[PDB]
């Protein structure tokens, strides 16, 4: 196999068509190719993430690996108050011999969507400059770090080796 | 000189103007057609081999142009190509939809 | 499996037609390092400008890097001295105001004998400044345009016989000689020859210039020592993670930042007007100018942006499949450049501003020109897409790094790859070649910089101080080799390029406490920590803003730039 | 530090001048209204066709066509530092006592290296990184003669230079004007 | 869900430790549509002549127009060689940036 | 300052404004980071000051 699904995901789409019983070689090769296509989306997604100068993989980083790979667009993954990780993975289990998760969603009226006030908008961008170093040492203004709380904040694979002049 | 006849039957005057073609566009569209021919018959040969035969019949080409490009040529062998499944789900799938609808009504 | 590769190489040379002695000598040429060129950035004594001959570049008529060693018209050679004496209202001003006339007269009289139209340029270029000081003599010198015209003007014919006398002090004569010795090949030697052969200085002259050159040779700096730079950091505040890579201009007056919502934002870094008012000043103070202009011509997200060395034009590459050109003095778009079918990721001008190279998702780099709408060369041969692009500082090779853990050097004329550099383990994201030109440096997304030499093509050494993360930008010291790397781990690091090589670069003669104990704490674990190379010397952290850009200015001051992230 | 002084040629004329007084690689003949491509020693003779009218576009541009690489390896001809020497005989302008002999050189491309690797892939069965390392080693050993030396940059030494060696925009009456074409 | 945390392990297997929440949801809703289309076209190709070569025909039918093409380096090398026949044009020698002719620039246009 | 300057001039032959190493230069323009907040607050109070018009 590989790590996508032996039958537990691909076969529940095979039954969604109507196809009753198919061999496990079909599901093995089919799920291998499906998660190869998933990795093929993921690699263009991390390329767009790197060239967008970011560290998370947002939903608009995989939605631009779709237009590049000509995939029909997955609409409906961007809503109001677009924050980083707008938490929406409330998927609800349903019992049986196996597990089924169905992503419950609450219906809403229209007149509480038109009579709803507008959010806050921040300021337009500005800049602010200071001295990071004057001769190779850091002048320890409020805008500089402390170089001892850099230990207790980040591990040395996302902050690198601390050496000073 | 055939492509000028093809643009002639596409672009006629018809009381609103005639559109003509230029030579670089003719070389471009002739290369497009030249690659289209091989791209149709190379998958049609795979379909005719998938049908466990040796001849290249017209049902392979009509199936390959119906499913993928949807050109929809009228009947050459287009009664065997037209396969009619209803795409209704299985009995496990409607069971799981009953479970999902039961949880969606038991939540309220 | 490398000895089998050596055998495959030897059989390839044997079947592709290299004699045994010839293949042995090409192997020995391939193994040895590129030696030192002492005129490495072309120092202004023995170095020349590039020719402006209206032809495109060509890397031919050129010997190998393995072998050991390595007309100038009168108007620029006079304008050098003119601006040098014009930049001073000091105590030595009117003596230069005295001596500026006969050098101009003798250059004009020595240039009418060779090129008449250059002489007609040279006379009327510097005419109306001392007409009130020297009378109608320049009106008498209107009618000289040929060799036989010199025999008409009796004072011009007398200027060959009558050597022009000038009584000059010792400090002014030594100032002029030590100014015109410090840059010979601009035209200082051409001024010195006219001074020696046509003037009469009151106080032999060849022995004086010999003493000048010998005393100037007696005190220089042979082997340079390192210097730690001062970094000025530009932190952008209200960008809600929608600011891509930015760039600063040269003179550092304009900053350009590409947004995820298809704008280019233009900041005056001095707080200036940035409205270019052009004293007429018609109307429209009713608008709001926050010393910042927005440029709306793209329909996709701007992923790169590059400034011309002229600094009057901007080049923005987007994810809509165009590269657009903007005028930095009327704030509009000028030209759209359509040659890609995938998003554009790295645009970069030439050194001389002639023609720009482009990187895109379609695994090919493209060479352009600012007057042609469509490309000129296609650089194909990478396995994955091209991330970064950069020229050699002469504008004659192209360097492209790509996401298949490699980079390439391309001939700009024939188009085909000349070098392929292997050894990385991650997408190469920023590349930069030293002002010497013999060494290439690049950084990957594994936090490892490494340097190769372009002659051998193999690795001199690497650099292992950044976190296991991206190295966004890269910059070089102007004179010498000190690498400044601004990456994604919020640090700007400083690297000595000349530690483990055959060039040690003048280490100090005589200890520390903080050295070799900072990464000997290792609280997180030995295998879960980074261990820096002996090349890393300093690292300035930025406190929760990452650095998109490092730009080393001319005077040992680098600038970093990035966005305040939360 | 280099050990000797090396003399390597990476032009067309210099490689040809080095490799005169040597036996040629091809042997092409221009007869009247028909041609012949033989070996230096059943060799075919062609009518005016379109494969030859595209091969002739690869000898006025002195490069080997990408198609021939494997079969050159099959036909045991002599290469000369990756190049092969086409000796053309124009029999229409012969002299009496021998036809008009030309001796041109054809140069390898990136396509010729790629097709040589694709034809190496028949009986070798290597991976991709072996082809990467092989191409890097051969691009090292066969591409000498690099112009890596930097001149003065004219944009920093602006004060010691003529004023109209640069072209910036200027402001005219109520508009401004760039330089075009 | 089992495939949300399996996608967590897949993303972490390729060193992707920061992402949003709806990204495995988007990957699952891609994989559902892709497998459903592939199995529907394979049911058509099995009614024509299930098995693995049927799946191969159904995923070779749609490889040809959407995802990243395979070994495109030799076609790009041929195309580059067709573009790199032409020698480079004559450049300006006045050390600046030269524009195209005025009709080929975005200035002589009207709304 | 009569005690510290004697020690400094005796040290060189081997508040304050001639300690050479510990000096930071000045920038031609730095951006606003705090003044614009109170500027927006008393501008909002000014929009309250204009007799109740939104």
Curated annotation (Swiss-Prot), chain A:
Which sequence ranges form a coiled-coil region, renumbered to this chain?
A: none
* Record's subunit section: Component of the 1.8 MDa SAGA (Spt-Ada-Gcn5 acetyltransferase) complex, which is composed of 19 subunits TRA1, SPT7, TAF5, NGG1/ADA3, SGF73, SPT20/ADA5, SPT8, TAF12, TAF6, HFI1/ADA1, UBP8, GCN5, ADA2, SPT3, SGF29, TAF10, TAF9, SGF11 and SUS1.
Task: Give any extra note attached to this record.
Answer: Present with 6506 (+/-1290) molecules/cell in log phase SD medium.
Q: What does this protein do?
A: Functions as a component of both the DNA-binding general transcription initiation factor complex TFIID and the transcription coactivator SAGA complex. Binding of TFIID to a promoter (with or without TATA element) is the initial step in pre-initiation complex (PIC) formation.
Name the family the entry cites.
Belongs to the TAF6 family.
Query: Domain remarks in the entry?
Result: The histone-fold domain (HFD) is required for interaction with TAF9. The C-terminal HEAT domain is required for bulk transcriptional elongation.
Q: Where is the Histone-fold domain?
A: 1-68
Which portion of the entire protein is included? 8 to 172 of 516
Q: What is this protein called?
A: SAGA complex/transcription factor TFIID complex subunit TAF6
Enumerate the subcellular locations listed in this protein's record, separating them with semicolons: Nucleus; Cytoplasm
From Swiss-Prot, chain B:
The organism sits in which domain of life?
A: Eukaryota
**One Gene Ontology term, aspect cellular component:** SAGA complex
Residue stretches making up the Histone-fold domain: 1-73
Q: Which UniProt keywords apply?
A: Acetylation, Coiled coil, Nucleus, Phosphoprotein, Transcription, Transcription regulation
User: Tell me, which GO biological process terms does this entry list?
Assistant: chromatin organization; positive regulation of transcription by RNA polymerase II; regulation of transcription by RNA polymerase II; RNA polymerase II preinitiation complex assembly; transcription by RNA polymerase II
Location in the cell reads: Nucleus
What main location does UniProt list?
nucleus
Q: Output the Gene Ontology terms for molecular function.
A: chromatin binding; DNA binding; identical protein binding; molecular adaptor activity; protein heterodimerization activity; RNA polymerase II-specific DNA-binding transcription factor binding; TBP-class protein binding
Extra info from the record? Present with 930 (+/-45) molecules/cell in log phase SD medium.
Write out the similarity annotation: Belongs to the TAF12 family.
Q: What does this protein do?
A: Functions as a component of both the DNA-binding general transcription initiation factor complex TFIID and the transcription coactivator SAGA complex. Binding of TFIID to a promoter (with or without TATA element) is the initial step in pre-initiation complex (PIC) formation.
| Oligomer and partners | Component of the 1.8 MDa SAGA (Spt-Ada-Gcn5 acetyltransferase) complex, which is composed of 19 subunits TRA1, SPT7, TAF5, NGG1/ADA3, SGF73, SPT20/ADA5, SPT8, TAF12, TAF6, HFI1/ADA1, UBP8, GCN5, ADA2, SPT3, SGF29, TAF10, TAF9, SGF11 and SUS1.
- Under which name does UniProt file this protein? SAGA complex/transcription factor TFIID complex subunit TAF12
The shown residues of the full protein are 418 to 525 of 539
Curated annotation (Swiss-Prot), chain D:
Q: Which domain of life is it from?
A: Eukaryota
> Where in or outside the cell is it found?
Nucleus
The entry's family comment says: Belongs to the SPT20 family.
Tell me how this protein assembles: Component of the 1.8 MDa SAGA (Spt-Ada-Gcn5 acetyltransferase) complex, which is composed of 19 subunits TRA1, SPT7, TAF5, NGG1/ADA3, SGF73, SPT20/ADA5, SPT8, TAF12, TAF6, HFI1/ADA1, UBP8, GCN5, ADA2, SPT3, SGF29, TAF10, TAF9, SGF11 and SUS1.
Q: Any other comment in the entry? A: Present with 4150 molecules/cell in log phase SD medium.
What is the documented function of this protein? Answer: Component of the transcription coactivator SAGA complex. SAGA acts as a general cofactor required for essentially all RNA polymerase II transcription. At the promoters, SAGA is required for transcription pre-initiation complex (PIC) recruitment. It influences RNA polymerase II transcriptional activity through different activities such as TBP interaction (via core/TAF module) and promoter selectivity, interaction with transcription activators (via Tra1/SPT module), and chromatin modification through histone acetylation (via HAT module) and deubiquitination (via DUB module).
Q: What is this protein called?
A: SAGA complex subunit SPT20
Full-length numbering of the shown residues: 112 to 360 of 604
Swiss-Prot record, chain E:
- GO BP annotation list: chromatin organization; positive regulation of transcription by RNA polymerase II; regulation of transcription by RNA polymerase II; RNA polymerase II preinitiation complex assembly; transcription by RNA polymerase II
What GO cellular-component annotations does this UniProt entry give? Answer: nucleus; SAGA complex; SLIK (SAGA-like) complex; transcription factor TFIID complex
MF terms in GO: chromatin binding; identical protein binding; molecular adaptor activity; protein heterodimerization activity; transcription coactivator activity
The record's keywords, sorted A to Z, are: Nucleus, Transcription, Transcription regulation
The superkingdom of the source organism is: Eukaryota
Does the record's keyword annotation contain Amino-acid biosynthesis? no
The principal location of this protein is: nucleus
Anything else known: Present with 7000 molecules/cell in log phase SD medium.
Q: How does it assemble?
A: Component of the 1.8 MDa SAGA (Spt-Ada-Gcn5 acetyltransferase) complex, which is composed of 19 subunits TRA1, SPT7, TAF5, NGG1/ADA3, SGF73, SPT20/ADA5, SPT8, TAF12, TAF6, HFI1/ADA1, UBP8, GCN5, ADA2, SPT3, SGF29, TAF10, TAF9, SGF11 and SUS1.
Question: Tell me, what does this protein do in biology?
Answer: Functions as a component of both the DNA-binding general transcription initiation factor complex TFIID and the transcription coactivator SAGA complex. Binding of TFIID to a promoter (with or without TATA element) is the initial step in pre-initiation complex (PIC) formation.
Protein name in the entry: SAGA complex/transcription factor TFIID complex subunit TAF9
Species for this entry: Saccharomyces cerevisiae (strain ATCC 204508 / S288c) (Baker's yeast)
């Amino acid at each position: 196999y590989t790590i996508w699904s032996p039958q537990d995901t691909v076969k529940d789409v095979a039954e969604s068509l109507g196809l009753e019983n198919i061999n496990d070689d079909v599901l093995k090769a089919l799920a291998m190719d499906v998660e190869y296509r998933i990795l093929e989306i993921i690699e263009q997604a991390v390329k767009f993430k790197r060239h967008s100068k970011r560290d998370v993989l947002t939903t608009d980083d995989v939605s631009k690996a779709l237009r590049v790979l000509n995939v029909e667009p997955l609409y409906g993954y961007y809503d109001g108050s677009e924050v980083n990780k707008a938490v929406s993975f409330s998927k609800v289990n349903t019992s049986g011999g196996q597990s089924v998760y169905y992503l419950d969603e609450e219906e809403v009226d229209f007149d509480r969507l038109i009579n709803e006030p507008l959010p806050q908008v921040p300021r337009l961008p500005t800049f602010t400059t200071h001295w990071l170093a004057v001769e190779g040492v850091q002048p320890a203004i409020i805008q500089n770090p402390n170089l001892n709380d850099i230990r207790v904040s980040q591990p040395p694979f996302i902050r690198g080796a601390i050496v000073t002049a | 000189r055939k492509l000028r006849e093809l643009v002639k039957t596409v672009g006629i005057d018809e009381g609103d103007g005639e559109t003509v073609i230029d030579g670089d566009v003719e070389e471009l569209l002739l290369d497009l057609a030249d690659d289209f021919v091989t791209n149709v018959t190379a998958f049609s040969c795979r379909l005719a081999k998938h049908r466990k035969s040796d001849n290249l019949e017209a049902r392979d080409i009509q199936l390959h142009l119906e499913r993928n490009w949807n050109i929809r040529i009228p009947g050459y062998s287009a009664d065997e190509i037209r396969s009619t499944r209803k795409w209704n789900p299985s009995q496990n799938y409607n069971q799981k939809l009953q479970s999902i609808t039961s949880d969606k009504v038991a939540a309220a | 499996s490398a000895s089998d590769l050596n055998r495959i190489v030897l059989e390839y040379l044997n079947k592709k037609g290299y004699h045994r002695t010839e293949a042995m000598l090409r192997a020995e040429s391939g193994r040895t390092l590129t030696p030192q060129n002492k005129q490495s950035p072309a120092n202004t004594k023995t170095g020349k400008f590039p020719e402006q001959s209206s032809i495109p570049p060509n890397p031919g008529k050129t010997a190998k890097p393995i072998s050991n060693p390595t007309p100038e018209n009168y108007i620029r050679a006079y304008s050098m001295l003119k601006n040098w004496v014009d930049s001073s209202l000091e105590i030595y001003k009117p003596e230069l105001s005295y001596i500026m006339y006969p050098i101009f007269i003798y250059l004009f009289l020595n240039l009418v004998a060779k090129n008449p139209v250059y002489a007609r340029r040279f006379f009327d270029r510097f005419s109306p400044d001392f007409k009130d000081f020297h009378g109608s003599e320049i009106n008498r010198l209107f009618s000289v345009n040929s060799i036989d015209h010199i025999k008409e003007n009796e004072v011009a014919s007398a200027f060959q016989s009558h050597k022009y006398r000038i009584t000059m002090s010792k400090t002014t004569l030594n100032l002029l000689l030590y100014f015109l010795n410090e840059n010979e090949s601009i035209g200082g030697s051409l001024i010195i020859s006219v001074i020696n052969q046509h003037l009469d200085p009151n106080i032999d002259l060849k022995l004086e210039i010999q003493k000048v050159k010998e005393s100037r040779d007696a005190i220089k700096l042979d082997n340079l020592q390192l210097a730690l730079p001062s970094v000025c950091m530009y932190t952008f505040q209200n960008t809600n993670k929608d600011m891509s890579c930015l760039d600063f201009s040269d003179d550092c007056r304009i900053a350009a930042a590409g947004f995820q919502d298809s704008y280019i934002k233009i900041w005056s870094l001095d707080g200036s007007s940035l409205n270019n008012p052009n004293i007429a000043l018609n109307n429209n103070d009713k608008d709001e100018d926050p010393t910042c202009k927005t440029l709306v011509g793209h329909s996709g997200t701007v992923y790169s942006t590059s400034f011309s060395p002229d600094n009057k034009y901007l080049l923005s590459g987007s994810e809509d499949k165009t590269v657009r050109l903007w005028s930095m003095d009327t704030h509009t778009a000028l030209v759209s450049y359509k040659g890609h079918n995938h998003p554009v990721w790295d645009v970069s001008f030439s050194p001389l501003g002639h023609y720009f190279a482009t990187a895109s998702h379609d695994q090919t780099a493209r060479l352009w020109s600012c007057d042609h709408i469509y490309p000129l060369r296609i650089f194909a041969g990478h396995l994955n897409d091209v991330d970064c692009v950069s020229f050699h500082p002469n504008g004659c090779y192209v360097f492209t790094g790509s996401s298949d853990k490699t980079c390439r050097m391309w001939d700009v004329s024939t188009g085909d790859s000349v070098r392929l550099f292997l050894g990385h383990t991650a997408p190469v994201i920023s590349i930069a070649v030293c002002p010497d030109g013999r060494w290439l440096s690049t950084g990957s997304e594994d936090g490892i910089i490494n340097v190769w030499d372009i002659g051998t093509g193999k690795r001199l050494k690497q650099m292992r101080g950044h976190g296991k993360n991206a190295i966004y930008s890269l910059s070089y010291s102007k004179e010498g080799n000190v690498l400044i790397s601004g990456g994604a781990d919020h640090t700007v690091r400083v690297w000595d390029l000349k530690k483990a090589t055959t060039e040690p670069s003048a280490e100090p003669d005589e200890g520390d406490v903080t050295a070799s104990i900072n990464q000997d704490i290792k609280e997180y674990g030995r295998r879960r920590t980074v261990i820096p190379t002996s090349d890393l010397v300093a690292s300035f952290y930025t406190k929760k803003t990452p650095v998109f850009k490092v730009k080393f200015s001319r005077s040992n001051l680098a600038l970093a730039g990035g966005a305040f992230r939360p | 530090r280099p050990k000797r002084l090396y003399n390597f040629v990476e032009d067309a004329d210099s490689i040809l001048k080095k490799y005169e007084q040597y036996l040629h690689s091809f042997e092409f003949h221009i007869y009247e209204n028909n041609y012949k491509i033989c070996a230096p020693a059943g060799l075919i003779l062609t009518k005016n066709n379109e494969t030859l009218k595209e091969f002739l576009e690869y000898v006025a541009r002195g490069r080997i066509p990408d198609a021939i690489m494997e079969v050159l390896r099959d036909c045991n001809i002599q290469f000369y530092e990756g190049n092969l020497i086409l000796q053309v005989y124009d029999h229409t302008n012969t002299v009496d006592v021998r036809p008009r002999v030309y001796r041109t050189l054809l140069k390898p491309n990136d396509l010729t290296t790629y097709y040589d690797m694709m034809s190496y892939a028949d009986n070798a069965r290597f991976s991709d990184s072996i082809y990467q390392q092989f191409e890097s080693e051969i691009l090292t050993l066969t591409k000498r003669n690099l112009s890596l030396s930097v001149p003065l940059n004219p944009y920093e030494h602006r004060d010691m230079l003529e004023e109209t060696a640069f072209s910036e925009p200027h402001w005219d009456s109520e508009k401004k004007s760039f330089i075009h074409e | 869900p089992r495939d949300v945390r399996l996608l967590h392990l897949l993303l972490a297997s390729q060193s992707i430790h920061q992402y949003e929440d709806q990204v495995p949801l988007q990957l699952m809703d891609f994989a559902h549509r892709y497998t459903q289309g592939v199995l529907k076209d394979a049911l058509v190709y099995n009614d024509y002549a299930l098995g693995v070569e049927d799946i191969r025909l159904a995923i070779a039918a749609r490889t040809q127009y959407q995802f990243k093409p395979t070994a495109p380096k030799e076609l790009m090398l041929q195309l580059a060689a067709e573009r790199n026949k032409k020698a480079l044009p004559q450049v300006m020698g006045t050390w600046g940036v030269r524009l195209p002719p005025e009709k080929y620039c975005l200035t002589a246009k009207e709304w | 300052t009569a005690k510290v300057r004697a020690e400094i001039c005796l040290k060189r032959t081997e508040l304050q404004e001639y300690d050479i190493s510990n000096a930071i230069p000045d920038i031609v323009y730095e951006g606003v980071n705090t003044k614009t907040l109170d500027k927006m607050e008393d501008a909002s109070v000014d929009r309250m000051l204009q007799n109740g018009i939104n």
